[PDB]
Amino acid sequence: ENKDMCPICKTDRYLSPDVKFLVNPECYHRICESCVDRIFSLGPAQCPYKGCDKILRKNKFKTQIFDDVEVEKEVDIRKRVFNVFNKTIDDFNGDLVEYNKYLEEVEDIIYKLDHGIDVAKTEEKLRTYEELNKQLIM
Amino acid sequence: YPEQYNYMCDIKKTLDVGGNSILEMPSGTGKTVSLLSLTIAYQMHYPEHRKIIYCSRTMSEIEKALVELENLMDYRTKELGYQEDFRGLGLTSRKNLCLHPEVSKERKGTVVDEKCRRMTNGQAKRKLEEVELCEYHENLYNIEVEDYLPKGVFSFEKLLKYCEEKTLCPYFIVRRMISLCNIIIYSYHYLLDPKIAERVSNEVSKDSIVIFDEAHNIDNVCIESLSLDLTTDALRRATRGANALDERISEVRKVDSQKLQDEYEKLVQGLXXXXXXXXXXXXXXXXXXXXXXXXXXXXXXXXXRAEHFVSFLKRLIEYLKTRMKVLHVISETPKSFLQHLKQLTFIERKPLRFCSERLSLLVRTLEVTEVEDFTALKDIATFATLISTYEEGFLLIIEPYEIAVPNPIMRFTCLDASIAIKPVFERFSSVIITSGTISPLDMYPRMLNFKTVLQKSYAMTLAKKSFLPMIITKGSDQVAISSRFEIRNDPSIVRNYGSMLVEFAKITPDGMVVFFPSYLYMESIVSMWQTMGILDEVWKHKLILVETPDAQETSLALETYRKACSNGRGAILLSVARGKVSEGIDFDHQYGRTVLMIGIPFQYTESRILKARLEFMRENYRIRENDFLSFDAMRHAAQCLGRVLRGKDDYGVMVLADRRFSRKRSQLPKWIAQGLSDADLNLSTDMAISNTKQFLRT
Ligand code: SF4
Ligand SMILES: [Zn+2]
Numbered sequence: 001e002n003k004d005m006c007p008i009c010k011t012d013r014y015l016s017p018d019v020k021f022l023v024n025p026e027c028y029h030r031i032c033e034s035c036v037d038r039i040f041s042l043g044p045a046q047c048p049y050k051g052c053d054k055i056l057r058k059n060k061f062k063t064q065i066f067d068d069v070e071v072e073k074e075v076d077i078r079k080r081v082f083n084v085f086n087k088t089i090d091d092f093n094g095d096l097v098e099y100n101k102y103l104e105e106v107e108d109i110i111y112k113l114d115h116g117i118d119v120a121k122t123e124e125k126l127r128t129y130e131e132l133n134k135q136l137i138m
Numbered sequence: 139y140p141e142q143y144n145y146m147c148d149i150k151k152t153l154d155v156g157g158n159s160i161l162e163m164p165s166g167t168g169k170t171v172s173l174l175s176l177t178i179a180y181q182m183h184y185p186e187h188r189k190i191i192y193c194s195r196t197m198s199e200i201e202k203a204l205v206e207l208e209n210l211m212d213y214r215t216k217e218l219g220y221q222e223d224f225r226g227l228g229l230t231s232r233k234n235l236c237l238h239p240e241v242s243k244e245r246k247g248t249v250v251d252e253k254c255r256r257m258t259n260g261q262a263k264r265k266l267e268e269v270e271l272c273e274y275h276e277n278l279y280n281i282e283v284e285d286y287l288p289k290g291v292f293s294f295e296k297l298l299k300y301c302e303e304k305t306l307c308p309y310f311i312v313r314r315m316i317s318l319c320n321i322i323i324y325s326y327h328y329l330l331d332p333k334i335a336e337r338v339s340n341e342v343s344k345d346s347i348v349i350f351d352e353a354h355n356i357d358n359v360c361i362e363s364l365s366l367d368l369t370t371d372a373l374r375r376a377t378r379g380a381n382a383l384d385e386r387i388s389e390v391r392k393v394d395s396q397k398l399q400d401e402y403e404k405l406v407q408g409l410x411x412x413x414x415x416x417x418x419x420x421x422x423x424x425x426x427x428x429x430x431x432x433x434x435x436x437x438x439x440x441x442x443r444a445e446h447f448v449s450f451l452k453r454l455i456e457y458l459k460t461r462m463k464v465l466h467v468i469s470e471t472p473k474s475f476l477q478h479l480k481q482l483t484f485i486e487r488k489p490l491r492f493c494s495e496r497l498s499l500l501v502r503t504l505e506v507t508e509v510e511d512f513t514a515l516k517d518i519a520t521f522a523t524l525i526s527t528y529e530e531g532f533l534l535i536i537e538p539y540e541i542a543v544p545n546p547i548m549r550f551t552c553l554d555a556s557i558a559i560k561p562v563f564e565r566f567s568s569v570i571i572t573s574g575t576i577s578p579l580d581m582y583p584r585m586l587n588f589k590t591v592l593q594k595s596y597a598m599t600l601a602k603k604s605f606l607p608m609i610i611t612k613g614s615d616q617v618a619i620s621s622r623f624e625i626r627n628d629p630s631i632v633r634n635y636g637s638m639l640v641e642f643a644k645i646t647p648d649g650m651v652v653f654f655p656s657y658l659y660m661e662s663i664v665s666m667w668q669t670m671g672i673l674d675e676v677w678k679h680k681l682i683l684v685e686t687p688d689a690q691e692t693s694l695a696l697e698t699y700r701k702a703c704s705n706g707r708g709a710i711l712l713s714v715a716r717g718k719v720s721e722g723i724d725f726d727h728q729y730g731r732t733v734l735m736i737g738i739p740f741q742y743t744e745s746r747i748l749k750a751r752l753e754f755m756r757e758n759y760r761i762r763e764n765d766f767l768s769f770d771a772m773r774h775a776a777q778c779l780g781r782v783l784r785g786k787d788d789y790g791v792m793v794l795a796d797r798r799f800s801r802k803r804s805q806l807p808k809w810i811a812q813g814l815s816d817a818d819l820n821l822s823t824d825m826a827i828s829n830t831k832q833f834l835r836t
C-alpha cells in the first residue's frame with residue numbers, strides 16, 4: 001500500500017520514492033532499502049514490522065509485483081514442491097487417471113500447506129519433501 | 139414481373155444444383171422473390187423436406203419477413219381454398235418475447251434471461267425437494283401448444299397477444315418449436331453465437347436451406363464475435379468475484395460439503411459429458427463454440443476440486459493484472475503470451491476445459507448467484523478459453539497509454555472469418571446468399587474463400603424514374619477536399635459547405651435525409667452555423683441522430699419524421715452511415731425523396747485493430763491499402779443508396795459528393811457528373827418530370 005511499506009518509512013511518496021521495498025520470504029513484510037540494509041548489515045535480526053519477531057536473514061531477497069501473500073506463498077511452495085516431485089509418476093507412460101490422481105494429491109498437499117490445518121499434517125508433508133528429495137538424489 | 143422472374147429461375151436452378159450462390163438483387167424489389175421461390179421449391183419436391191432459414195441483420199427485416207410470410211400464407215390460402223400445415227416461427231429478442239418483466243420488473247435490459255432462469259430454477263426446485271413457478275407453466279410442452287402453430291400462424295406480435303390471451307409463455311413455445319422445424323426468422327448474431335449457435339444447431343438438426351439476407355456485413359458479424367476490451371474495471375470485478383468465490387468456498391466447506399463431493403465424483407467418473415448430459419433446464423455458461431472447438435475428454439483440473447480452481451484462478455487474474463500494468467505500446471502473440479504465462483506459473487493449455495467444467499460445477503452449487511461477479515468470471519473464463527485454444531490469426535493486443543490514467547486496456551483480436559462460417563458448408567447445402575448492397579460481388583469469392591457461383595443483377599429499366607446524378611463542383615471545389623480528412627481542416631470552409639447544404643435544402647424542401655461519414659462534422663456545424671433559415675422556413679424542425687444513439691430517441695425521431703412528412707412539413711435527418719439503424723423501410727413519400735451524402739464514407743484509421751486486420755488480410759489475399767478504403771466505404775454508401783430505391787412506381791435522387799466515387803461501382807451504374815448549382819435546377823426539373831411520366835407510362 002501507499003501508506004505502509006516500512007514501519008519507519010511508511011510515507012515516502014513526497015520524499016521522492018527512489019528506494020525499493022524488499023520482502024523477506026521468512027517474514028512477508030515490506031522494508032525499504034535504507035532500513036533493511038542496516039538490518040542485515042548490523043546482524044541477522046528480526047524486523048520491527050508491527051512487532052515482528054521472525055528473524056530477517058542476510059540477502060536472499062526478491063522483487064514483488066504484488067499478487068497477495070497467499071498466492072505468492074502458494075506459487076513459491078507450488079514451484080518448490082513441483083521441483084521436488086519432478087516428473088515422478090507423471091509423463092512416464094501416458095496414463096491419464098493415475099496422473100490426475102497424483103496431481104490431486106500434490107494440490108491437496110499444497111492446500112494443506114496454505115491452510116496449515118493444525119501443524120501436524122504439514123510436518124508429514126515436509127517428511128514427504130525429504131523423501132522425494134532423497135528419491136531425486138538417487 | 140419478368141425481371142424478378144429471372145431471379146426466380148436463378149434461385150430455382152441454384153437450389154436444385156449448386157450448394158451456394160451469390161445472387162445480387164435490386165434494392166427494394168428483391169425481398170418477396172426468395173420468400174415464394176423457397177416455398178414453391180419446397181412444394182415441388184415434397185411438402186416437408188427443407189425449411190426456410192432466413193437470416194437478417196436487424197429486427198425490422200425480421201418483422202417485414204414475418205408480415206410478408208403472412209402475405210404468402212394468405213396468398214396460398216385465397217387462391218386454392220385448401221388449408222395446409224402452416225409454418226412461420228418468429229424468433230425475436232428475449233426481452234420482447236417475454237411477458238413477466240413487463241408486469242413487475244418494468245425493464246428492457248439484457249438480464250431478463252437471468253430472471254427467466256430464476257423462474258425455471260423455481261420450477262425445477264418445486265419439482266424436486268420442494269419463488270413461484272412463474273406466471274403459467276407445466277403446460278407449454280404439451281401437444282396442444284405444439285399444434286397451436288401449424289394450425290394457425292402465431293409469430294412475434296400474434297404470439298405475444300396469443301400468449302397474453304391463452305395465459306402462456308412464448309419463450310418455451312418458441313424454444314420447443316425450434317425442433318418443430320418451422321420457418322425461423324432470426325439474425326446473424328444467433329447463427330454465429332458462442333452461446334446460442336450450439337443449442338440452435340442442436341434443435342434445428344440441420345438439413346435445411348440457409349438464406350443470407352443482406353449478406354454484406356458478414357465480416358463485421360464474424361469480427362464482432364470476439365474482441366472484448368479489458369478496461370481495468372473488469373479486474374476489480376474479477377477480484378470481488380474471486381472474493382465471492384472464496385466466501386462460497388467457506389459456505390460449502392462450512393456445513394454442506396456432501397453435494398460438492400458427489401458432483402465432484404460425477405466429474406471424476408463422467409466428466410463434462412456426464413455433467414452436461416444429466417442437467418436439464420439449467421443455466422449454461424459461455425463456450426468458444428463447441429462444434430467448432432471439437433475438444434472432448436475434459437478433465438476437471440487434472441481431477442481436482444474447487445479450491446484449486448479458485449486458487450489457480452486468483453493466480454490467473456493476478457497474472458492478467460500484471461500483464462495489463464505495463465509501459466504503453468506492446469503487442470502480444472497468443473502463443474508467446476501462453477508461454478510467458480507458463481514461465482510465470484504452470485497451468486498448461488487446458489484452462490478451457492477447466493472453465494467450461496468448473497463454471498457448471500459452481501452453478502450446480504450456487505442458489506443465490508451475484509450477477510456482476512459471475513459475469514466477470516464468465517469474461518475471464520472466455521479469455522482463458524481463447525488463450526488456450528484458437529491461435530491461428532488470433533492476436534492479443536494491449537491498448538497504448540494515452541492520457542496515464544484512462545488506459546489499462548487489453549483487447550483480443552479474432553481470427554480468420556472463414557473458420558467461423560465454415561460449419562454451414564458441411565451442415566447444409568444450397569445456401570442462398572442474397573444482398574442488394576454488393577458491388578462488385580468479387581470481394582466475397584476473394585475474401586472468405588468458398589466455391590460458389592456469381593449472379594449479378596439483370597434488371598434496369600425506366601431510367602427516367604431513377605434520377606442518379608452526382609455533384610463534383612460545389613461552386614469552388616474546396617469543400618470536397620476538406621471533407622475527406624479524418625480531422626476537419628479550416629472551419630470556415632466547413633461553414634461554407636454547411637451554407638451549401640442550406641442552399642440545397644432550401645431549393646428542394648421535400649423530405650431530406652443527410653448522411654455523414656462521422657459525427658465530428660455534425661458536432662462542428664451544429665455548434666455555431668451562422669444560419670438557421672432552413673429550420674425557420676421549410677423544415678420547421680431538424681432531426682439529428684445523437685452521437686450516442688438511444689432507442690427511444692431514434693424511435694421518436696423516426697415517428698417524428700413520418701408525422702412531419704405526413705403534415706406537409708418535412709425535416710432534415712442528419713444521420714451517420716456508420717451509426718446505428720441502417721433503416722430499410724421505404725415505399726412511400728414519407729421517406730426522403732432527396733438524399734444528401736457528405737462526401738464519401740470513411741473508416742477511422744490510426745487504430746491497432748485496423749493495422750492488425752490490415753496486415754492479416756495483407757498476408758491472406760494481398761489486398762493491402764486498396765480494399766479497406768473502397769470496399770467498406772462502398773458498403774456504407776450502398777446502405778444510403780438502398781434507401782433511395784423503393785420500387786419503380788416511386789422516384790428519388792441521391793447526391794454523392796467527391797470525385798473518388800467514380801473509382802467505385804454503384805447500383806444501377808447510370809450517373810452523370812456535374813456541379814451542384816446546376817443540380818439544383820436539374821432536380822427542379824426532375825421534381826416535375828417524375829410527376830409527369832407516371833400517368834404517361836401507365
Ligand atoms: S417462463 Fe416465460 S414469463 Fe416466466 S420468466 Fe421465463 S420467459 Fe419470463
Ligand atoms: Zn524505512
Ligand SMILES: [Zn+2]
Nearest residue numbers: 027029047052
Ligand atoms: Zn518480519
